[PDB]
Structure formats: structure tokens, C-alpha cells
Amino acid sequence: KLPPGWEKRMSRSSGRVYYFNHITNAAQWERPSGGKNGQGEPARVRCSHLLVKHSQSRRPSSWRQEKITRTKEEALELINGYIQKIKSGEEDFESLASQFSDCSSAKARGDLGAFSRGQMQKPFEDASFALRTGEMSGPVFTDSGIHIILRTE
């Protein structure tokens, strides 16, 4: 049961029960699904993203700053902060990506356009295709850094 990647979990040293997606790293309180079968995954999707680079990114530099020195742990801290702000409603995905994404797609408010499998780095690809329209991922690690992905189509 539950859509691809989803599983009911419980927080450790805490007792909060929630739903987690092992492919997208998404987490939420709501059950992800309420019969359709043999649906597979979309052959093409459109996604926007917000990238946070770190010292170990293949290109430790971005339009936002010449030299990226933050550690991977610091980047994850930032990513989690952006997710928290989006989930509270204090900020929107587009505004944050336009201002803080280390990817040049920031100029397009994070929009990457449409793509098929075999086009993006595997972790990014797996997460994008496991997202349903309008859903946002949790932290996704690639060689570029850490991403937050939003499927728009």
C-alpha cells in the first residue's frame, strides 16, 4: 500500500508517527494516499529546485558567491531551514530559490524545465520521478550539493 517510496514511520526518542518517502526524503503528517494499478512513473516531468552547495560540490562556486566554504553539514542545516520556512508558509519555494539557490536556474526561479530519465544525476532523477505533481522533496544529495525539488508538471 501507499505510493512508491512511502512508509509509515515513528520518530526516535520521540513518538510522533509520520509518513516518509525513502526516494525523495519527504516527510509529512498526512497519509500520502487515500484503485489504480500498473501506473508506473511519468515518462517526463518538470521540476524546479533550490540548490545549496558546499566545499565538496564538484564546482564549489556559484553566482551567489565565488568561494563556497560551508561544509556538507552546514549545507544540510540550511536546506532544512529552507524546508521549515516553506512548510510554515512564511516563505514560498520560488522566492527562496530565486534568492538563495546556488544553481543558475535561480534566474528562472528554480525552474529546470521538463526532462526524462537519464538526463539528470541519478539521485535527483529518482526523487523527481517519485514526486507527484505539486509535491516537494526532502534533502536530495548529488555531486552538485544538496537539493530541494518541487515537481510542477
Curated annotation (Swiss-Prot):
Instruction: Look up what happens after changing W29A.
Output: Loss of binding to phosphorylated target proteins, including to phosphorylated RBBP8/CtIP; decrease in DNA repair of double-strand breaks by homologous recombination less efficient than that observed with wild-type protein
Localization terms from the record: Nucleus; Nucleus speckle; Cytoplasm
Enzyme class label: isomerase
Q: What is its main location?
A: nucleus
Where would one find coiled-coil regions in this protein?
Answer: none
Q: What is the effect of changing C103A?
A: Loss of peptidyl-prolyl cis/trans isomerase activity; decrease in DNA repair of double-strand breaks by homologous recombination slightly less efficient than that observed with wild-type protein. No effect on RBBP8/CtIP
EC id: 5.2.1.8
- Which residue ranges does the record annotate as region Disordered? 28-44
Q: Which InterPro entries match?
A: PPIase_dom_sf, PPIase_Pin1, PPIase_PpiC, PPIase_PpiC_CS, WW_dom, WW_dom_sf
Q: Which GO terms describe its molecular function?
A: beta-catenin binding; cis-trans isomerase activity; cytoskeletal motor activity; GTPase activating protein binding; mitogen-activated protein kinase kinase binding; peptidyl-prolyl cis-trans isomerase activity; phosphoprotein binding; phosphoserine residue binding
| Residues with the Phosphoserine modification | S61, S98
- Tissues in which the protein is found: Expressed in immune cells in the lung (at protein level). The phosphorylated form at Ser-61 is expressed in normal breast tissue cells but not in breast cancer cells.
Q: Where is the PpiC domain?
A: 42-153
The entry's function note states: Peptidyl-prolyl cis/trans isomerase (PPIase) that binds to and isomerizes specific phosphorylated Ser/Thr-Pro (pSer/Thr-Pro) motifs. By inducing conformational changes in a subset of phosphorylated proteins, acts as a molecular switch in multiple cellular processes. Displays a preference for acidic residues located N-terminally to the proline bond to be isomerized. Regulates mitosis presumably by interacting with NIMA and attenuating its mitosis-promoting activity. Down-regulates kinase activity of BTK.
Query: Tell me, how does this one assemble?
Result: Interacts with STIL. Interacts with KIF20B. Interacts with NEK6. Interacts (via WW domain) with PRKX. Interacts with BTK. Interacts (via PpiC domain) with DAPK1. Interacts with the phosphorylated form of RAF1. Interacts (via WW domain) with ATCAY; upon NGF stimulation. Interacts with PML (isoform PML-4). Interacts with BCL6. Interacts with FBXW7, disrupting FBXW7 dimerization and promoting FBXW7 autoubiquitination and degradation. Directly interacts with RBBP8/CtIP; this interaction depends upon RBBP8 phosphorylation.
Domain notes per entry: The WW domain is required for the interaction with STIL and KIF20B.
* Protein name per Swiss-Prot or TrEMBL: Peptidyl-prolyl cis-trans isomerase NIMA-interacting 1
Where does this protein come from, organism-wise?
A: Homo sapiens
